[PDB]
Write an enzyme that holds these catalytic residues in place. Structure first.
Site, mmCIF file in Angstrom:
data_model
loop_
_atom_site.group_PDB
_atom_site.id
_atom_site.type_symbol
_atom_site.label_atom_id
_atom_site.label_comp_id
_atom_site.label_asym_id
_atom_site.label_seq_id
_atom_site.Cartn_x
_atom_site.Cartn_y
_atom_site.Cartn_z
ATOM 1 N N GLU A 1 63.740 11.109 75.829
ATOM 2 C CA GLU A 1 62.751 11.321 76.908
ATOM 3 C C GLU A 1 62.281 10.042 77.600
ATOM 4 O OE1 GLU A 1 60.128 13.544 74.393
ATOM 5 O OE2 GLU A 1 60.745 15.520 75.234
ATOM 6 N N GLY B 1 59.287 23.805 76.394
ATOM 7 C CA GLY B 1 59.758 25.176 76.335
ATOM 8 C C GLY B 1 59.101 25.984 77.449
ATOM 9 N N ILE C 1 58.656 26.071 68.950
ATOM 10 C CA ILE C 1 58.640 27.508 69.147
ATOM 11 C C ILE C 1 60.059 28.058 69.337
ATOM 12 C CG2 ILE C 1 57.580 29.364 70.468
ATOM 13 C CD1 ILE C 1 55.637 27.465 68.825
ATOM 14 N N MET D 1 54.476 19.900 72.204
ATOM 15 C CA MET D 1 53.843 19.440 70.977
ATOM 16 C C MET D 1 52.917 18.207 71.103
ATOM 17 S SD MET D 1 57.053 20.178 68.454
ATOM 18 C CE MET D 1 56.159 19.719 66.979
ATOM 19 N N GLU D 2 52.730 17.689 72.315
ATOM 20 C CA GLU D 2 51.949 16.484 72.496
ATOM 21 C C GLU D 2 50.884 16.500 73.614
ATOM 22 O OE1 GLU D 2 55.786 15.838 70.629
ATOM 23 O OE2 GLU D 2 55.722 15.732 72.847
ATOM 24 N N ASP E 1 64.533 24.681 77.269
ATOM 25 C CA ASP E 1 64.716 25.941 76.551
ATOM 26 C C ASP E 1 63.558 26.869 76.943
ATOM 27 O OD1 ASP E 1 62.512 25.963 74.165
ATOM 28 O OD2 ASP E 1 63.302 23.909 74.526
HETATM 29 N N1 2EL Z 1 60.423 25.255 72.180
HETATM 30 C C1 2EL Z 1 59.634 24.166 72.103
HETATM 31 N N2 2EL Z 1 58.567 24.243 71.297
HETATM 32 C C2 2EL Z 1 57.743 23.130 71.235
HETATM 33 N N3 2EL Z 1 57.992 21.994 71.961
HETATM 34 C C3 2EL Z 1 59.080 21.956 72.748
HETATM 35 C C4 2EL Z 1 59.550 20.981 73.530
HETATM 36 C C5 2EL Z 1 58.843 19.619 73.689
HETATM 37 N N4 2EL Z 1 59.161 18.571 72.732
HETATM 38 C C6 2EL Z 1 60.538 18.504 72.208
HETATM 39 C C7 2EL Z 1 60.342 17.976 70.820
HETATM 40 C C8 2EL Z 1 61.081 18.936 69.854
HETATM 41 S S1 2EL Z 1 60.798 18.692 68.110
HETATM 42 C C9 2EL Z 1 62.188 17.538 67.810
HETATM 43 C C10 2EL Z 1 63.455 18.347 67.700
HETATM 44 O O1 2EL Z 1 64.481 17.390 67.491
HETATM 45 C C11 2EL Z 1 65.772 18.009 67.355
HETATM 46 C C12 2EL Z 1 66.648 16.807 67.607
HETATM 47 O O2 2EL Z 1 67.322 17.146 68.790
HETATM 48 C C13 2EL Z 1 58.843 17.821 70.590
HETATM 49 O O3 2EL Z 1 58.448 16.467 70.915
HETATM 50 C C14 2EL Z 1 58.248 18.758 71.576
HETATM 51 C C15 2EL Z 1 60.664 21.402 74.116
HETATM 52 N N5 2EL Z 1 60.874 22.664 73.673
HETATM 53 C C16 2EL Z 1 59.896 23.031 72.820
#
Ligand code: 2EL
Ligand code: 2EL
Lengths: 231, 239
Positions: free
Chosen positions: B19, B85, B159, B180-181, B204
């Site tokens: 990011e 998301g 989620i 998440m932030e 997503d």
């Molecule tokens: N479906 C989702 N639920 C919560 N947060 C997110 C996000 C936002 N960020 C993406 C990130 C996901 S948690 C780390 C997952 O790492 C897998 C390595 O690819 C967090 O910093 C929140 C995108 N899709 C989400």
């Protein structure tokens, strides 16, 4: 030697604050920091406000502005261990988030990516706290303390914690966040809290009734601990 | 918006390497400081002074990061960038989401009468800065991107459909995105009275496929959010 002390609520810090000699006050980021000496020992006492982000903000400010050698998290807690009654003491051997879930990517339940699954409390601080418990003749349990942004009030909220963390001895809303900041800064950390309720469907009523008692007992512990750590 | 120092300085926060990496590469005369597990990259982005922080994931990481950025770099405003998301049905991967407000979806002190998601001592939600929203909307139009403006909700969970998603939709039917932030940073910014906005892009739609989607489309979301942020920094500093 400078001891950092963090509490969330006015009720949890007010007794310690009163005992501070040469008390200077810093107000910033919505936090108050009281600095001075507690029975001769340099301390910095932070009133952080409630929850994970408030605690993280507060801890970060305390570490940057006051550079304490260790941090003690004090206050109330919801008791989970069966031998705990209102007013009894809990000491962290470890902290974990009960509300964190990135299990979709294979992390342990409670574990945030880039963090350990739990944060180990400092062994020397734990040993010192145990000496305080003996000196004060208190009933206490040492174990895992879990933190989330929820006030636990029986029903499914409590059942979920007991299920995911059957060895957790207490639950509250700030400790793990402070342990996380301390981890990132390599600063020794311990939680010394007192039971205000047992996190059941009457926990809000018990909290209201016994917050003052929990503050008094955690304060006794913390005052004793500060003195033991100076030496 | 009036600069605190001589010229405008824009804070940017992202959680993940993926990011922040594209923005980092565009910073001129870049210098890096590491503290508290966080990296901050300072320098100029197309002539505008920026401070870009890589916080790590989740509420505490973001809160710690935001606090450090405010204390060490004193930015005039903070933009939170990255993936999200999508909850609004019109969102596709790569589309932009802008916060008009943030709330915690996992905070519950309702035993004492608080609104679900509200922590004691805080408002139930944090409203994003009107001037930052308006500038972001202007960028969206100029770049001809699809975007939704609305409530973004944060919690310490990824989620992935089922009950987790159902609960958010039940409790926050107006929420357009989840991450998440963002709410953590908004909370820090509230306490320091610093203007904040979220400008993220969809990776997503937080359903049972979200783990697979996230992995494939994190790069696309970073690319589009980066495009927006770069454009916004220019708009904020130069009229
Ligand atoms: N479906 C989702 N639920 C919560 N947060 C997110 C996000 C936002 N960020 C993406 C990130 C996901 S948690 C780390 C997952 O790492 C897998 C390595 O690819 C967090 O910093 C929140 C995108 N899709 C989400
Ligand atoms: N049952 C419980 N669940 C979660 N945390 C606690 C606690 C510990 N803290 C006490 C406090 C409860 S929330 C404050 C309720 O009072 C609102 C007036 O400000 C938070 O800082 C967490 C005691 N019992 C708990």
């Amino acid at each position: 030697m400078k001891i950092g002390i963090i509490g969330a609520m006015e009720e949890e810090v007010t007794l310690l604050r009163d005992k501070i000699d040469n008390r200077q006050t810093i107000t910033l980021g919505g936090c108050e920091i009281y600095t001075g000496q507690l029975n001769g020992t340099e301390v910095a006492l932070l009133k952080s406000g409630i929850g994970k982000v408030a605690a993280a903000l507060g801890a970060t400010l305390l570490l940057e502005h006051c550079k304490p050698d260790v941090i003690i998290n004090t206050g109330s807690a919801g008791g989970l261990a069966s031998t705990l009654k209102v007013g009894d003491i809990v000491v962290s051997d470890e902290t974990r988030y009960h509300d964190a879930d990135v299990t979709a990517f294979g992390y342990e339940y409670g574990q945030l990516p880039g963090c350990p699954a739990g944060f180990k409390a400092d062994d020397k601080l734990i040993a010192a706290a145990e000496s305080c418990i003996r000196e004060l003749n208190l009933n206490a349990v040492r174990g895992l303390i879990v933190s989330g942004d929820a006030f636990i009030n029986g029903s499914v909220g409590l059942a979920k914690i007991r299920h995911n963390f059957p060895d957790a001895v207490a639950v509250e809303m700030e400790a793990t966040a402070i342990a996380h900041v301390c981890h990132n800064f390599n600063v020794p950390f311990v939680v010394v809290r007192a039971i205000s309720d047992v996190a059941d469907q009457q926990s809000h009523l018990s909290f209201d009734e016994f917050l003052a008692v929990a503050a008094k007992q955690s304060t006794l512990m913390v005052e004793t601990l500060v003195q033991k750590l100076a030496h």
